[PDB]
Amino acid sequence: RPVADFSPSLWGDQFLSFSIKNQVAEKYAKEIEALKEQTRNMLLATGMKLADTLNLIDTIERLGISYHFEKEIDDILDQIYNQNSNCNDLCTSALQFRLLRQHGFNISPEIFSKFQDENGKFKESLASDVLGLLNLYEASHVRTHADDILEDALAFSTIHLESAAPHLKSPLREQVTHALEQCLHKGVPRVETRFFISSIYDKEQSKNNVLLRFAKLDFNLLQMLHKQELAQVSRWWKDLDFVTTLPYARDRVVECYFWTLGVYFEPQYSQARVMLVKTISMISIVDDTFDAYGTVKELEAYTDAIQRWDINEIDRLPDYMKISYKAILDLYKDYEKELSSAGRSHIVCHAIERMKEIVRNYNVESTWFIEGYTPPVSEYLSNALATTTYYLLATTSYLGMKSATEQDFEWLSKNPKILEASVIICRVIDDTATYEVEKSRGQIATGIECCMRDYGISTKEAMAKFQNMAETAWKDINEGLLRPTPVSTEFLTPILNLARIIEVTYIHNEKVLKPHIINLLVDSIKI
Numbered sequence: 167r168p169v170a171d172f173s174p175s176l177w178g179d180q181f182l183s184f185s186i187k188n189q190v191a192e193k194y195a196k197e198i199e200a201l202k203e204q205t206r207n208m209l210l211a212t213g214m215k216l217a218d219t220l221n222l223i224d225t226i227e228r229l230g231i232s233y234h235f236e237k238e239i240d241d242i243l244d245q246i247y248n249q250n251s252n253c254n255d256l257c258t259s260a261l262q263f264r265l266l267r268q269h270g271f272n273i274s275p276e277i278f279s280k281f282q283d284e285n286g287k288f289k290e291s292l293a294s295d296v297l298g299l300l301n302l303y304e305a306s307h308v309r310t311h312a313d314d315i316l317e318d319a320l321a322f323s324t325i326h327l328e329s330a331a332p333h334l335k336s337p338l339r340e341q342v343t344h345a346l347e348q349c350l351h352k353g354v355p356r357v358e359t360r361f362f363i364s365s366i367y368d369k370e371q372s373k374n375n376v377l378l379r380f381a382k383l384d385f386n387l388l389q390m391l392h393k394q395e396l397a398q399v400s401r402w403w404k405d406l407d408f409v410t411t412l413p414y415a416r417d418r419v420v421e422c423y424f425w426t427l428g429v430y431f432e433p434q435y436s437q438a439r440v441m442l443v444k445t446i447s448m449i450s451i452v453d454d455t456f457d458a459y460g461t462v463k464e465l466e467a468y469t470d471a472i473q474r475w476d477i478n479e480i481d482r483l484p485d486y487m488k489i490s491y492k493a494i495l496d497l498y499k500d501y502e503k504e505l506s507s508a509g510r511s512h513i514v515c516h517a518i519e520r521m522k523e524i525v526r527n528y529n530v531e532s533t534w535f536i537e538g539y540t541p542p543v544s545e546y547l548s549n550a551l552a553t554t555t556y557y558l559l560a561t562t563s564y565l566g567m568k569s570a571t572e573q574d575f576e577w578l579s580k581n582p583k584i585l586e587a588s589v590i591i592c593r594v595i596d597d598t599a600t601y602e603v604e605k606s607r608g609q610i611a612t613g614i615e616c617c618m619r620d621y622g623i624s625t626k627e628a629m630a631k632f633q634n635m636a637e638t639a640w641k642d643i644n645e646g647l648l649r650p651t652p653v654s655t656e657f658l659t660p661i662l663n664l665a666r667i668i669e670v671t672y673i674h675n676e677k678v679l680k681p682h683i684i685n686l687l688v689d690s691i692k693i
């Protein structure tokens with residue numbers, strides 16, 4: 167058997183039992199309702215300037231409380247789009263652009279022309295307006311293939327912000343430094359929200375007290391739910407005891423739950439999160455079995471057993487592979503039960519199909535390993551994409567979503583372009599990150615490898631090539647979000663967020679997640 171030593175879960179049992187102080191919760195909830203209405207009337211406030219209406223929305227979003235005003239914010243942005251009036255300053259133009267695009271409104275990038283010379287190059291004279299540069303920078307990340315008028319925005323705004331940063335007052339200085347490390351659009355929502363509330367807004371001299379309080383109270387209250395969900399999931403995982411039965415598998419239920427929190431954090435997605443975290447944990451095991459344990463023979467049998475998908479096959483499997491197999495079979499049988507109530511069990515199959523698919527590809531992966539085969543990039547991707555596990559997760563995220571319909575699942579089943587881009591981003595960056603290690607273990611069928619061999623190029627060029635793939639992928643994800651959308655935006659976000667997570671997790675080529683996990687599931691925002 168392969169020699170392995172995954173680090174035991176560094177979390178212990180801190181998340182095993184969480185008792186919600188009902189009083190505090192009802193206390194928090196009660197004021198939040200009040201603060202919610204105050205904020206609402208703030209948005210419905212008439213006679214506001216564009217600049218100001220945009221900042222109010224920008225702030226509410228960064229504070230992570232915008233999920234309470236989806237309609238109001240939509241109408242306000244909608245009307246702004248329709249009245250499409252060109253604002254004269256870089257700062258408002260960039261924010262106006264970003265906010266609309268993120269919401270699907272295909273505002274024209276024409277708005278940025280007045281800010282550049284004849285050769286569509288940004289006017290250097292702008293280099294002295296930090297706020298304008300910051301918003302341009304944040305805006306340059308939501309561009310699509312049709313926005314080549316913004317092909318310099320990123321480099322232009324970056325070089326100057328770096329140059330101006332050191333002498334800026336706080337928290338602005340922190341905000342700029344952070345943005346240069348993590349743009350807003352490609353970051354994990356709750357993660358970016360915790361930072362803004364605590365590190366920026368709270369230290370903002372001009373801060374709106376009603377909003378800040380609202381933001382802190384809401385974040386902390388929601389955290390109670392998350393802490394509550396994680397507690398449940400921790401028992402579930404503990405009461406499976408793979409930690410003992412399957413000593414080869416990792417113990418990362420907490421890390422998985424975090425991933426889930428990145429896809430969606432709102433309370434309505436509570437059940438969704440719990441179903442989704444179970445699949446990630448499970449598939450986590452399967453990977454370990456293929457990646458470091460099972461034998462070509464066993465694996466072969468395992469894959470076959472998964473395709474047939476029926477209890478009886480258990481016998482055909484080794485002892486340990488039976489634990490996995492049955493667990494998996496029961497998991498999906500549970501989803502069906504959970505979905506019985508609302509008669510949405512007919513969809514679970516879509517996820518099962520994704521499972522069988524990923525298992526097949528895992529098997530191919532091992533075969534190419536044994537044969538020592540190095541396929542051409544195209545052949546690699548055809549197998550390697552599914553093993554990012556993204557088709558599986560994306561599909562699974564819909565299960566708990568009470569509004570997902572057969573149509574939604576059918577759209578997803580055809581590998582829509584937005585989904586393909588998200589999967590590629592995961593593949594491309596994971597391959598760039600784990601090239602070294604996998605290279606050592608002798609895995610000749612690794613993306614960067616196939617690339618190098620395929621195009622007869624250096625490890626560098628191969629990684630550069632992959633970067634453009636990911637860049638193109640983002641531009642596609644951004645386009646996918648533009649209206650008219652194939653399905654409801656509600657089902658696009660989970661995909662967008664899956665891409666955001668991978669970017670945040672490999673920001674610098676493990677965990678990484680600790681800090682975040684601590685900031686989101688352990689420490690509360692001190693009010």
Ligand SMILES: CC(C)=CCC/C(C)=C/CC/C(C)=C(\F)COP(=O)(O)OP(=O)(O)O
Nearest residue numbers: 425446449450451453454457553554555596
């Ligand atoms: C696909 C990746 C890497 C990350 C996405 C994050 C998630 C949600 C992972 C769960 C499934 C999985 C493939 C593992 F746990 C093993 O990754 P590991 O990198 O140890 O194994 P391989 O992806 O190399 O087989």
Ligand SMILES: [Mg+2]
Nearest residue numbers: 453456457528
């Ligand atoms: Mg694997």
Ligand SMILES: [Mg+2]
Nearest residue numbers: 453454457458
């Ligand atoms: Mg592995």
Ligand SMILES: [Mg+2]
Nearest residue numbers: 596597600604
């Ligand atoms: Mg890898």
